[PDB]
Amino acid sequence: ENCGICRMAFNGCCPDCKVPGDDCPLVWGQCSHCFHMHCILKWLHAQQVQQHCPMCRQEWKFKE
Ligand SMILES: [Zn+2]
Ligand SMILES: [Zn+2]
Ligand SMILES: [Zn+2]
């Protein structure tokens, strides 16, 4: 069976990981659907609001 986002096999990696062979773990939802972590990450990042700082208008980014 295949990841719902990238439509590549679960038993293999997502498109980012094919060339350089990085680890590409799977994740599961309570709804029972499985995705490559990398794929669902792109999804969740795009769908989530970009938060701002509680105290100013700037996008919230952690200082590293
Ligand atoms: Zn995928
Ligand atoms: Zn991957
Ligand atoms: Zn689902």
From Swiss-Prot:
GO terms for cellular component: anaphase-promoting complex; cytosol; nucleolus; nucleoplasm; nucleus. Zn(2+) 3 binds at residues 14, 17, 24, 38. Keywords: Cell cycle, Cell division, Cytoplasm, Metal-binding, Mitosis, Nucleus, Ubl conjugation, Ubl conjugation pathway, Zinc, Zinc-finger. Changing residue 39 to S: Greatly reduces autoubiquitination activity; in isoform 1. Changing residue 3 to S: Greatly reduces autoubiquitination activity; in isoform 1. Changing residue 24 to S: Slightly reduces autoubiquitination activity; in isoform 1. Changing residue 17 to S: Slightly reduces autoubiquitination activity; in isoform 1. Pathway: Protein modification; protein ubiquitination. A zinc finger (RING-type) spans 14-57. Changing residue 6 to S: Greatly reduces autoubiquitination activity; in isoform 1. Expressed at high levels in skeletal muscle and heart; in moderate levels in brain, kidney, and liver; and at low levels in colon, thymus, spleen, small intestine, placenta, lung and peripheral blood leukocyte. Auto-ubiquitinated. Belongs to the RING-box family. Together with the cullin protein ANAPC2, constitutes the catalytic component of the anaphase promoting complex/cyclosome (APC/C), a cell cycle-regulated E3 ubiquitin ligase that controls progression through mitosis and the G1 phase of the cell cycle. The APC/C complex acts by mediating ubiquitination and subsequent degradation of target proteins: it mainly mediates the formation of 'Lys-11'-linked polyubiquitin chains and, to a lower extent, the formation of 'Lys-48'- and 'Lys-63'-linked polyubiquitin chains. This is Anaphase-promoting complex subunit 11. It comes from Homo sapiens (Human). The lineage of its organism: Eukaryota, Metazoa, Chordata, Craniata, Vertebrata. The chain holds residues 21 to 84 of 84 of the full protein.
